[PDB]
Subunit: 319 residues, 4 copies
């Protein structure tokens, strides 16, 4: 069991961006910018910084060229600069390795703390970030499949109850979960910002990052992503969907980037910000928890997930 | 080969209605009225007459109580009363069994001809029909999954080239087809009213009726049918979809009625009314002809189709 | 009264394209291509040929540089090459000036007849046209406000009853009209292709062209055109809408090009192809005939309409 | 001018419900339930309690029969039971009249504090509420115009800067405002829950309630409300829209209930939960601040607003 620290938890606002290592930067740019339409805040021959339509911070996704495709960091923004010090004290009390950089790990982020969390994931906590043009009314740039916000991460770990306790002490609130008759948690969705989730834990060999997710404004935007991929003759990169998830009630689509990192695009959220928001518990034997309409099962969705890196940049051993 | 008659073909306007035999009239009414929202023109203890949101003729679907679920008649409306006489002469020259009723076979239809066509299908041709209130602006009745028009039938027959020639002689124009390397037709979509099709021929044991199709105004209406079925806990009746078909470019959904009759709901059409409308030919080995996005294959869609009846009510032998 | 010729009417398929004279080709190209997204079939320093997303004939709109902006031709495609000879005989019997060009008046069109019709409008009838790539499944090109088909023209003329008879003799069928209590027609919508209309006659000084109309697949496409114009700071070119018309039941938007030519973009049509389609008559005093939702009246929509040219290229006197 | 109390402010979660006095309960029920589709949590001969599709607290709207239509209370939910005590101490310090009921003022709410606030408005603060079935996946009940969440109130007051300082002290954060060249605030939108706003202050004679607003999932839901009102021949109750507001970027509609209370239905929000969310300041001369598309001005929207009641149930004098 991971103990609850005496030190106070940092006040986490929301998931904010992911840094993914990619192997061929130009092929990754073709996918994220030309196919998906994300906006380039900054790029060079080593990295591409991308943001969604409604974002004002510098980026939601950093693509970094490297040797092995993997998640390098899943970042959460905290409420105040002092919260980065709180995160540092917190994870040092849990006995985790931490690295602090007053001027950031990537461009457009200031004082930041990266840690190898108890579950083996590279989390980053930061407050300072370069504000850029919020594109929410730039309808002259709006694409038929526009990604409007980054919403959440989904993590694969072997012991979900152990991880759930740790995230709950960190302040995440479970909105939905999947349990058996004994009441054991098999998967949990948890939030800070008032939507179904900022991250989710699902059981399996780990640490691995199952996906990063963006939303669209409407369902037709998701359908357009599928239609565009079929016209580009890359429909084999659509993994699962479109469908409706029972858990989260999202209309979803999962596609695969050039290094096989899985990106979820979905639409339809509901408000979870009240402190007594009713947790929805789904039975592990209820098929509708996975697909409200009964869509056939896609096996790779249960077997494949991205490697994650430690603070030296090496792949974390998968347990 | 089915020879081209010397007698002129009747001028067919469009597919107009289907008469389906159902085994439990109340369970069938629950599906077509309470779940799908079709409008009741007339009903009694033996039949239910239903129409779509934009129809003005009496009905698009007649549900008739009977012991063996089957297609009883696929009806096409013709341009003038005289075309019913043309249809009769035409089919008599082809040597087919015909039955003429000056007052119709079903309520709301006048002078009508039913025939056992060369492929074993019970086609009806009629001009006279009772006009009813066109509900196209009755937004106070509009449901979130509203079926707005009946569009086509899809037939399963063993020799598609044979049937294609016969329907082309009858005046249908092929808009899209599926061919092998040698140029042989494996399936064809054919129209009279200016959309992709009024009927289609696909290969398989037959005669059998694969489905009858209705359209919605937009894609979200089809998604709402799926969501409503999930909330009613009848998602097991969603057979295939939603997806995008390559052939016809339709956004589709296939569901099953209580007698397993397959109903397609789709949206998005294109104009095919010019005489030199470009026929689109898909190769028999191109998967995108089936699913533009790559959705997995649903086996029952290729094995199951409805029985059809002859003019005496007996099931037509499936060759 | 315009007499019905003894000569047979040409069999008209549908409205097919308009040739608009524009004063600044560059500004016009920016509006039609960069803002509205129409596709270029051909262009040079004097003309731009544009087509909609689902079109296969060479174009739906020809922009021709000229000194005075005006409609140069409203073109209808006929069923066969011989219908062009029929059209020539028909209009000569009516005593109208005609001009025949075996090789066409504009690129992409073959043998064509242009006439100064009985109401003073420049109609063109043609069959031959260069086919081009039908872009209906080119989702990699699809814009959030995509215009998918050309649908109709709308003409302003002083005596609607006089013109309505002439168009009925030509084969157009009235689907909807506006009448007073005496039964007198004030405006009428008429079709050949099976939608609400290919052209409409409204009362006013004429001949003038009120607008040319394109459709989108769904309502959100029209809202996006308005949003994009707002982002480009050209919202002052949105003249009327979005709204719902009572007559035609269309969800509409009217915008103004650089020369003030009015373009309608709408969605939602219904089928009118049966010969006894029920004509919908709206009373002159029913305000919902104009706006189903009661949207405020825009005066310019009732006072402004485009000039039209005679066969010498000079503006027709407006009566 | 309104001092910042020494007492800590109650932690406000979000606007949660409004209690409106109506003169004819049956006519009001027809509008809110039969026309708009809100869900009944409880009703009797004197009151109707209604909730939106995704709500889990007892209600979002209470209609209470009375002699003079007016706002009886605008209620905000607080984070903990102790926050109701904080609210009482805070308003006592401000010198405002307050009334505390340990068992609530309306059914379904527990301990609650109502106050006549400094701007003359009847605010309620509560934590305890009866949870009910959250209907967010009840697609069997989903209407084509479904109202999914309660989002905000909009208040009219004579001195917006004075009210803005009081609300900022209470913890609301301004996301957008309208200012003149001197920097003086004319209108402000402010939030607690992370959307553009929970309430807004606009300048005019007051106190009056301009409107209460609900959202829909997508734009087509708002279009359907207009369409249904046109079919029910109550289009004259559509006051303004549909349109796109520059301030808030919302796709909006304003309609009037039987007592002329204004209801806004809109869709599209963006995230404002970060503490340094960029405030968007619109200039008082920028017409796009009101309508992004340039929709004409509707005079009544600037002159009419609902009366509000004091704690004795009598109308507050309007300054």
């Amino acid at each position: 069991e991971i103990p609850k620290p005496v030190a106070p938890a940092p006040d986490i606002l929301r998931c904010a961006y992911a840094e993914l290592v990619v192997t061929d930067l130009a092929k990754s740019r073709n996918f994220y910018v030309d196919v998906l339409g994300l906006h380039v805040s900054y790029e060079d021959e080593n990295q591409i910084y991308l943001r969604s339509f409604e974002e004002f911070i510098h980026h939601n996704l950093v693509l970094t060229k490297g040797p092995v495709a993997a998640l390098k960091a899943m970042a959460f923004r905290v409420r105040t600069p002092e919260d980065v010090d709180k995160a540092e004290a917190y994870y040092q009390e849990l006995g985790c390795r931490t690295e602090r950089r007053k001027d950031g790990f990537v461009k457009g982020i200031g004082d930041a703390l990266r840690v190898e969390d108890p579950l083996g994931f590279p989390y980053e906590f930061f407050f300072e970030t370069t504000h850029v043009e919020r594109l929410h009314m730039r309808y002259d740039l709006y694409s038929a499949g526009e990604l409007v916000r980054l919403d959440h991460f989904n993590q694969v770990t072997p012991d979900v109850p152990r991880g759930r306790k740790y995230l709950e002490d960190l302040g995440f609130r479970v909105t939905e979960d999947i349990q058996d008759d004994e009441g054991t948690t098999y998967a949990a969705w948890m939030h800070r910002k008032g939507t179904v989730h900022d991250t989710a834990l699902t059981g399996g060999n780990g640490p691995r990052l199952h996906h990063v997710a963006f939303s669209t404004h409407e369902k037709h935007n998701i359908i357009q992503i599928c239609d565009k991929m079929g016209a580009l003759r890359i429909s084999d990169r659509i993994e699962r969907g479109p469908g409706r998830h029972g858990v989260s009630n999202a209309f979803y689509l999962y596609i695969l980037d050039p290094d096989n990192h899985r990106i979820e695009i979905y639409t339809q959220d509901y408000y979870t910000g009240d402190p007594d928001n009713p947790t929805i518990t789904w039975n592990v034997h209820d098929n509708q928890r996975r697909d409200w309409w009964g869509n056939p099962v896609v096996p790779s969705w249960y077997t494949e997930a991205s490697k994650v890196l430690d603070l030296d940049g090496n792949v974390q051993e998968i347990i």
